[PDB]
C-alpha cells in the first residue's frame, strides 16, 4: 500500500550527476582559547573508514569498551571502562564520549571530553 502511495504521489519526481569527491583528511589542530568560559571542550579523532567498511563493527566494539561517562553516572569507580573509572575516581572530567562518525569513504573516529 505504501508502494502504491509512493507511485501515486512521488512519481513526478525527476531522476535524470553531483557525486561526491573523496574527502582528504589532515592531521591538524584548531584551538579557540577562550579563558572566560568555565569548562574546556576537546574533540579528537583519527580518519575512520566510512559507511561501508566492515571495520565499523569491530571499531564500535572497541569504542564500547572505552565507553562514555557523565558525572551523574551512578557506576563511578566500580565502572567497567578504565577511562570512566579513572575519570570518576580522579575527577578528571565532567563527561566524555567515544564516537565513530561515518561518511562516504571517510570518517571521524575518536572521543570528546569536557573537563
Amino acid at each position: 500500500q505504501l508502494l502504491d502511495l509512493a507511485q501515486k504521489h512521488f512519481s513526478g519526481l525527476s531522476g535524470t550527476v553531483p557525486t561526491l569527491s573523496p574527502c582528504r583528511f589532515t592531521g591538524s589542530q584548531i584551538c579557540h582559547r577562550e579563558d572566560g568560559l568555565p569548562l574546556a571542550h576537546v574533540a579528537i579523532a583519527v580518519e575512520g573508514p566510512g559507511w561501508a567498511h566492515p571495520d565499523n563493527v569491530a571499531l564500535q566494539v572497541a569504542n564500547a569498551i572505552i565507553g562514555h561517562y557523565d558525572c551523574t553516572y551512578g557506576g563511578g569507580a566500580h565502572l567497567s571502562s578504565p577511562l570512566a573509572s579513572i575519570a570518576a575516581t580522579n575527577k578528571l572530567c565532567q563527561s566524555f564520549q567515544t564516537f565513530n562518525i561515518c561518511y562516504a569513504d571517510t570518517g571521524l573516529l575518536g572521543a570528546h571530553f569536557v573537563c
Binding site: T26, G27, S28, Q29, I30, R33, E34, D35
Partner: protein
C-alpha cells in the same frame, strides 16, 4: 607555575598542522636567502662598526710595533 595557570588569554585561535602532513624545509632558499639578507642588513650597522675599528687598531698597532723595532737613519 605550570601549563594550566600561566596566564589569561581570550579570543585567540591557533591553527596548525601535523609534521607528517608537511615539508620540513618549505621554500628553504627561495624564502630563506631573502630573509637572511633582510636580517643582516638590519644589524650590520650596529654590529660591524666595532669590529672594523678593532681590525684597524690591531692593523695599526701591530705595524707600529713593527716600525719601532727597526732602526731609522740617525
Amino acid at each position: 607555575r605550570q601549563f594550566g595557570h600561566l596566564t589569561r588569554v581570550r579570543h585567540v585561535i591557533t591553527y596548525s598542522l601535523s609534521p607528517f602532513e608537511q615539508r620540513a624545509f618549505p621554500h628553504y632558499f627561495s624564502k630563506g636567502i631573502p630573509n637572511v639578507l633582510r636580517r643582516t642588513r638590519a644589524c650590520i650597522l650596529r654590529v660591524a662598526p666595532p669590529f672594523v675599528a678593532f681590525y684597524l687598531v690591531y692593523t695599526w698597532g701591530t705595524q707600529e710595533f713593527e716600525k719601532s723595532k727597526r732602526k731609522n737613519p740617525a
